[PDB]
């Protein structure tokens, strides 16, 4: 199965359900840069480049992997050429600041482009995602000199970015980093230390790589309040903008990984490398606050993108592979067996993927819409509500879309039976690739702890009530037909509210309760949020039913979600309600 | 990084067999076993199996994955060290540990050979599958081959000097063996000539043995259409002289091997038969039925392969979780002299670890319970006892296959996720175990086909009588429980009630509605699985409560039981609700609307 961009579903979500073009027209910051016509032409081109240049390199990229030769890292055959086309097309800076040569597309558009590229070839997609991420942090916190020297080449994709955070002993716990930044009389800093697991730390796609390095000044306090952020170029830039002296840094090695094998994962060594402070001393983590809001959604989209790619392979296979006969009797009388889509269990797996992919795509767009409101709204109370929904929902997007993407890729493989275990079919690679999204931009367990700890307990539940108030107003608006979906949605919202109240009470004076609830609570939240997404899509499909087979497909998928997936909330809620006690009965030596 | 050293779980294996199931009291009143096995005999075999699996097989797992098998002009080579390690294994008697002593097998009951299978499969799944094939092939030949074929082939196969293979699958025929096309031409000398292509043949060709004895499904020229025309043939790689020495190379070969997700050291062969000489096993047109006993044992075996990956993943994860320091316990810093606390202090890490621990220990107990039913079915002098054991084998083997492998996958995912980013790196061995575990969910058939067998044949097919045999035993256990055991027996009874109601719902709903059976199948099998594990956990709890004292093993077991009941058993409700939705939501769309 060739990758085909899901542009019809993407139009349905953005233009028919959320009607985002209505919102742009009101915001003169976006009215200048995008309209329905512009957005449509951007998606058609993105679909063309992703299917035509990027998707064909996915399988051979996994089979070849990256190579390390005396410090130089090479990507698989055709990756540098495909990157050059991508970058020349403007795709690295599509959501970039126009003040420095970016296209200025809102996140609802750049997030769809992200899905297309990551579906086509996740290894390829992560490369420009780094650069776009690094730009967010430099735009928000770097000095005018740094922004003017580095942003234009990064938005053009001529220079790549990297995030150099993780050390051998420090991933989640960045407060204990050892990398040091020594202040120089000339205003610069010399960075010394070792970073690991650095995606795109070194490669052959760009003439330069602009590293954002977490380090501590020698007099820094211990823990996270001692952390600073530095811009450290691979190649120092001469006064006239030409490339100058190679910086005192290098890639010592690349990792042997489960998946995204075409993604160079670098041990980066810094030996008094010259760099410049981004933001303020001791406020390195705050310098990444915006970057990480956008990255949490972007990682969710990466997980979803692998699920979408697996479904495209699985449905084509389920229509072509013949095996056994339908339980109600032979369907394909002209043949020796029936297409496997006739079998109940095959339909169960396919529909689980379809409902999770389409629900995840809707939720990704909803979250992108909150980021765009937070950024672009002229109303301060509107911006602030959007900021609170970003803070609540980005961890959910990160952990839930990646956990559902993994289940989706596993169904996609299992549909093929034994053939799914063979690499030439591509399904096994998507499982391996999808596993990276559950630890990329930190572990999902840390995302779920942020949700329950800071976003739920930390706001007294107020942030959640902003979300569930919007859902309840939706329910109150529902006509009789939409009641099929609004009624179970309301019951799901009540279940989540009671579980929230249980947790606020149980967590008082019992810190272990927070982590104990975290992951399963985040799942209850996720299935509740997808019920809201599915009810919103059911409302539009009910209105347009009979106008196009697309709407009948949407409603059948919705009905599967509510019938077989939404009931997942009950077991998860009961497990959460068991509390932390059974996690702590045993001492570490008793395991 | 490094895959943690494998250590056989002999203490847990003793608790399950000797303490919970009391297997020596059962072997006492079984004359055919009194002769060959007792507690001390069994303990000495387990100690020996633990040494060879940890010492010579486990160290080859990672390098075996990294090298994989090679194909050179039809010769298949296993990774470096596999032939030498196989020679050691075979010379130790491990290939024939469960085989018939009449042809030189050790004759161990399934409760013991199932434990040896767990050890080798945990150490190196690719390795463990090779002797698995031979043992399975022996079961079929012993059950159905003529005296002449048994006498000529079984001794070398039990000794592991000659390997076996199962040559069933064709490009167009996997689940549906009924449409196979491989042809068997009768010869005047009493032999047949086999022509056809088989694919996905594990150990079809390799460098571990001087001969491979293929069990090939094929059809005579005048055979009926469909599965009723299918016969089974013994087709050796190399024809054997009267004196048992190797004669002429048979007219067959390996055209290629597969590129796979996992078990990369397991040669997966396209096998071409070009008028290859072989001999009929059992009866013309009863080739599928000649594998019935072999497939009952293989289904438990594949369950055990999934559990093995999970046990290996836990050994690596618990060592890592005690050594890796990151962040501080929620209730306040624990390692005051260090920069961070061991990650085992974190609620989410404990949840993942305890999920693996409870699924591994529950699964181990369930695998021993099923093995016990296979042994009772084979060895009991009492026809009532034998018949009931056969009925539970029929019911529980599909649950063993699909549940232990599905829970194995979840277990290996947790084991990788515990490491965070480190878990994605091949040197730690956690990502391989996920890839190896995925094979078990499609080995000896897809899990969805096992689930369909359970609900279609074993539940609907028996009007629920097989299930009521199982649940009768559970309720008698519940009725017997004292006050302390009530902690576990009370929620067990509620789980049994839930399962019985779901069974009654399904028997009614399936009437005239064939889609309902497949619609319910996988999730119903999971409800059954968690109910069965609740039974296993209550049995282990009863023994631990009785022995709770100076041996801390019993405290660990009860804490694990308590996690199973608090956090995993509740999974039955959502699965029961999903099943009760029925097939309707699955058939709202036409194929074109997907
Ligand atoms: C392929 C790859 C690409 C990556 N790319 C980059 C990148 O470009 N740049 C970069 O800087 N990083 C990168 N990372 C690092 C990535 O974000 C890691 O997931 C992160 O460092 C955490 O994993 P770790 O192995 O360091 O685990 P640790 O942080 O040591 O975590 C170990 C375990 O402890 C748990 N844990 C730790 N602290 C807590 C706590 N407080 N509460 C609860 N549980 C806790 C974790 O969830 C996990 O289960 C990459 C990782 C990989 C594998
Ligand atoms: C690594 C590996 C090793 C193998 N080794 C051997 C071996 O040594 N010997 C051997 O003989 N075989 C072997 N096989 C083949 C294997 O045992 C099964 O034949 C295979 O797993 C079935 O998958 P398939 O691709 O043939 O799927 P199909 O049978 O084509 O099924 C495709 C899909 O349709 C579903 N389906 C099909 N029929 C039905 C039905 N009636 N009801 C519901 N769902 C249905 C399946 O569950 C699956 O999801 C091996 C396979 C692999 C991957």
């Amino acid at each position: 199965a060739d990758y085909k961009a899901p542009l019809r579903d993407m139009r349905f979500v953005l233009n028919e359900v959320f009607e985002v073009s209505r919102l742009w027209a009101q915001l003169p910051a976006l009215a200048e840069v995008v309209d329905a016509e512009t957005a449509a032409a951007i998606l058609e081109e993105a679909g063309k480049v992703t299917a035509g240049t990027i998707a064909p390199l996915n399988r051979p990229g996994d089979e070849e992997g990256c190579q390390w030769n005396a410090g130089a890292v090479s990507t698989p055959a055709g990756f540098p050429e495909a990157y050059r086309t991508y970058a020349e097309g403007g795709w690295v800076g599509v959501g970039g600041d126009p003040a420095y040569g970016g296209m200025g597309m809102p996140k609802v558009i750049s997030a769809q482009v992200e899905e297309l590229v990551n579906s086509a070839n996740l290894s390829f997609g992560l490369y420009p995602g780094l650069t776009a991420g690094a730009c967010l942090a430099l735009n928000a916190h770097a000095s005018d000199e740094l922004k003017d020297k580095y942003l234009p080449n990064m938005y053009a994709g001529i220079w790549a970015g990297s995030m150099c955070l993780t050390e051998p002993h420090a991933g989640t716990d960045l407060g204990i980093i050892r990398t040091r930044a020594e202040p120089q009389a000339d205003g610069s800093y010399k960075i010394s230390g070792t970073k690991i697991f650095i995606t795109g730390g070194e490669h052959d796609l760009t003439e330069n790589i602009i590293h954002l390095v977490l380090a501590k000044l020698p007099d820094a306090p211990a823990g996270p309040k001692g952390i600073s952020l530095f811009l450290v170029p691979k190649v120092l830039v001469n006064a006239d903008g030409s490339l100058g002296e190679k910086n005192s840094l290098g890639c010592g090695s690349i990792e042997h990984k489960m998946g995204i094998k075409a993604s160079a994962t670098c041990v980066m060594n810094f030996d008094g490398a010259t760099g410049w402070l981004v933001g303020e001393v001791n406020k390195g983590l705050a310098a990444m606050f915006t970057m990480m809001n956008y990255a949490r959604l972007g990682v969710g989209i990466a997980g979803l993108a692998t699920g979408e790619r697996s479904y495209q392979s699985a449905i084509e296979y389920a229509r072509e592979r013949i095996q056994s006969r339908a339980p109600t009797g032979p369907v394909a009388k002209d043949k020796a067996a029936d297409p496997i889509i006739v079998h109940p269990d095959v339909r169960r797996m396919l529909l689980t993927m379809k409902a999770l992919n389409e629900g995840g795509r809707a939720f990704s767009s909803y979250v992108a819409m909150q980021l765009d409101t937070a950024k672009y709204s002229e109303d301060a109370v509107t911006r602030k509500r959007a900021e609170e929904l970003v803070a609540l929902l980005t961890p959910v997007a990160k952990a839930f879309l990646t956990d559902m993407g993994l289940e989706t890729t596993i169904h996609g493989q299992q549909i093929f039976g034994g053939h799914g275990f063979i690499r030439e079919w591509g399904q096994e690679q998507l499982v391996r690739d999808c596993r990276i999204t559950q630890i990329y931009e930190g572990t999902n367990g840390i995302q779920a702890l942020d949700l329950v700890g800071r976003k739920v307990i930390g706001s007294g539940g107020a942030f959640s009530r902003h979300f569930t108030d919007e859902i309840k107003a939706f329910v109150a608006s529902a006509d009789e037909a939409l009641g099929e979906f609004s009624k179970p949605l309301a019951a799901a919202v009540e279940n989540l509210e009671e579980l929230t109240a249980w947790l606020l009470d149980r967590a008082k004076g019992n810190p272990n309760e927070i982590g104990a609830a975290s992951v399963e609570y985040l799942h209850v939240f996720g299935y509740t949020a997808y019920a809201y997404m599915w009810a919103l899509m059911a409302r539009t499909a009910l209105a347009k039913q009979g106008e196009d087979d697309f709407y009948a497909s949407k409603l059948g998928t919705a009905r599967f979600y509510f019938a077989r997936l939404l009931p997942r909330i009950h077991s998860l809620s009961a497990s959460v309600r068991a509390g932390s006690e059974s996690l702590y009965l045993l001492d570490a030596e008793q395991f």
Side-chain angles (χ1 to χ4, degrees), chain A:
Chain A
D2 296 325
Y3 177 65
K4 186 173 188 220
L7 299 189
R8 174 68 186 92
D9 196 56
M10 281 179 171
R11 291 199 289 279
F12 166 81
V13 170
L14 274 198
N15 308 341
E16 299 184 60
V17 177
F18 295 121
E19 298 202 61
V20 297
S21 75
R22 289 199 340 115
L23 304 179
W24 300 340
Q26 309 283 256
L27 305 169
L30 286 180
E32 295 283 58
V33 317
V34 66
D35 62 13
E37 168 180 25
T38 297
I42 283 178
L43 266 293
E44 283 294 323
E45 184 57 25
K48 203 152 295 165
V49 189
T50 54
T53 306
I54 308 303
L57 287 172
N58 204 19
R59 277 265 75 230
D62 173 80
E63 296 288 336
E64 174 170 12
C66 291
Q67 297 269 270
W68 186 97
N69 298 102
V73 171
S74 60
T75 58
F79 270 63
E81 298 70 18
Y83 179 85
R84 169 203 213 245
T85 297
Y86 192 77
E88 288 182 2
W91 297 108
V92 185
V94 74
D97 189 348
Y100 305 88
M103 223 179 298
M105 286 303 115
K107 191 54 181 184
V108 291
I109 296 305
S110 68
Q112 289 192 150
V113 170
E114 195 206 315
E115 191 207 300
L116 296 189
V117 189
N118 284 343
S119 269
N121 188 157
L122 180 59
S123 288
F124 183 94
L126 291 184
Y127 284 117
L130 289 180
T131 305
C135 288
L136 277 179
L138 294 181
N139 208 313
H141 289 279
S143 69
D144 288 348
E145 284 172 60
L146 293 184
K147 285 193 301 203
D148 294 333
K149 186 158 266 234
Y150 297 97
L151 282 185
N153 277 323
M154 293 172 74
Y155 288 126
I158 297 284
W159 296 346
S162 85
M163 311 301 315
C164 297
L165 322 188
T166 302
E167 297 182 3
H169 69 296
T172 300
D173 186 355
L174 286 175
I176 62 180
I177 54 162
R178 287 171 192 178
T179 298
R180 203 162 300 160
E182 185 65 37
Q184 306 296 297
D186 70 359
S188 73
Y189 290 81
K190 284 187 186 198
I191 320 303
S192 300
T194 288
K195 299 289 191 188
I196 66 162
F197 298 167
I198 307 314
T199 306
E202 180 66 83
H203 54 70
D204 55 356
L205 306 175
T206 60
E207 71 173 17
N208 207 355
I209 303 175
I210 308 308
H211 301 109
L212 301 186
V213 189
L214 279 188
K216 293 191 162 191
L217 271 61
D219 58 348
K225 307 174 82 64
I227 294 168
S228 304
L229 183 63
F230 301 88
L231 188 162
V232 184
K234 168 185 159 172
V235 188
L236 299 168
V237 179
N238 294 319
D240 61 19
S242 64
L243 294 191
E245 187 185 13
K246 276 182 182 300
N247 207 349
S248 195
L249 66 88
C251 170
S253 64
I254 62 187
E255 298 300 331
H256 308 298
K257 303 191 310 297
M258 175 181 222
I260 53 163
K261 298 199 184 179
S263 183
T265 309
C266 301
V267 177
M268 297 297 302
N269 308 296
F270 300 87
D271 183 17
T274 292
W276 294 268
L277 177 71
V278 179
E280 289 174 69
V281 168
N282 296 325
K283 299 207 194 202
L285 296 182
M288 302 188 294
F289 169 84
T290 294
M291 164 186 278
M292 281 180 171
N293 291 333
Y294 282 80
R296 287 193 288 274
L297 173 61
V299 173
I301 286 168
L304 164 64
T306 68
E308 165 69 24
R309 183 71 187 79
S310 183
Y311 181 79
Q312 285 187 34
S313 289
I315 186 51
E316 182 170 300
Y317 196 74
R319 290 167 164 156
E320 298 185 356
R321 182 58 177 190
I322 63 169
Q323 200 75 4
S324 318
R325 296 297 201 181
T328 64
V331 162
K333 293 278 230 309
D334 52 319
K335 296 207 244 263
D338 292 346
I340 53 166
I341 189 160
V342 303
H343 297 116
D345 186 61
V346 175
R347 276 167 166 265
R348 187 187 56 86
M349 289 187 283
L350 279 165
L351 285 168
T352 301
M353 301 177 74
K354 200 181 187 292
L356 292 175
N357 287 337
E358 282 176 42
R361 177 169 304 114
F363 187 65
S364 81
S365 284
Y366 181 85
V367 177
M369 196 175 72
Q370 302 305 330
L371 286 163
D372 286 339
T373 303
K375 185 166 164 65
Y376 291 112
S377 175
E378 313 267 49
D379 181 314
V381 165
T382 300
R383 274 198 312 270
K384 204 82 182 47
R385 188 178 164 272
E387 283 161 23
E388 292 159 2
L389 285 181
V390 166
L392 176 71
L393 293 182
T394 50
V396 180
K398 201 293 198 189
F400 199 64
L401 269 66
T402 60
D403 283 0
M404 295 301 103
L406 179 60
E407 182 186 349
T408 298
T409 61
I410 285 173
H411 291 316
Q413 177 177 218
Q414 198 67 15
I415 283 157
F416 280 65
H419 288 251
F421 201 78
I422 310 310
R423 302 211 301 271
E424 283 88 347
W425 293 102
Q427 296 298 74
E428 65 85 31
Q429 180 192 325
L430 293 173
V431 173
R432 298 190 280 109
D433 285 4
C434 192
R435 281 297 289 160
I436 217 283
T437 70
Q438 293 161 288
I439 55 75
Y440 193 71
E441 299 288 329
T443 74
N444 282 354
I446 296 306
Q447 293 301 326
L449 179 62
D450 176 57
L451 168 69
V452 291
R454 302 233 305 101
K455 309 309 163 59
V456 177
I457 301 317
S459 70
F463 291 176
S464 294
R465 291 199 317 265
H466 304 341
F467 187 50
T468 62
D469 283 345
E470 177 185 300
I471 297 170
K472 286 165 171 184
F474 170 79
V475 169
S477 81
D479 73 357
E480 192 277 348
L482 184 58
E484 179 184 350
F485 306 100
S486 67
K487 179 167 160 165
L489 175 56
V493 167
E494 179 61 30
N495 176 71
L496 171 63
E497 295 203 298
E498 291 177 20
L499 186 61
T500 302
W502 177 88
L503 173 62
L504 285 164
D505 180 66
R506 175 64 70 104
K508 281 195 228 311
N510 308 300
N512 285 338
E513 295 293 0
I514 302 179
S518 59
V519 164
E520 286 174 328
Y521 175 99
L522 188 151
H523 279 225
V524 173
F525 192 108
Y527 289 116
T528 310
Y530 278 29
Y532 173 45
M533 294 309 97
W534 271 112
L536 284 164
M537 295 192 281
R539 177 173 59 179
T540 312
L542 284 166
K544 295 190 178 198
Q545 177 149 59
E547 301 179 352
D548 171 2
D549 211 31
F550 180 91
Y551 304 104
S553 295
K554 189 60 66 164
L555 282 164
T557 315
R559 287 177 171 130
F560 178 85
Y561 179 79
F562 275 87
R564 312 267 315 204
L565 300 189
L566 183 51
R568 288 180 175 188
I569 65 185
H570 297 113
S571 285
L572 284 171
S573 304
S575 293
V576 167
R577 281 170 181 278
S580 66
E581 195 193 342
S582 80
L583 278 55
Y584 283 89
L585 300 173
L586 296 187
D587 298 322
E589 294 69 34
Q590 297 179 293
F591 277 73

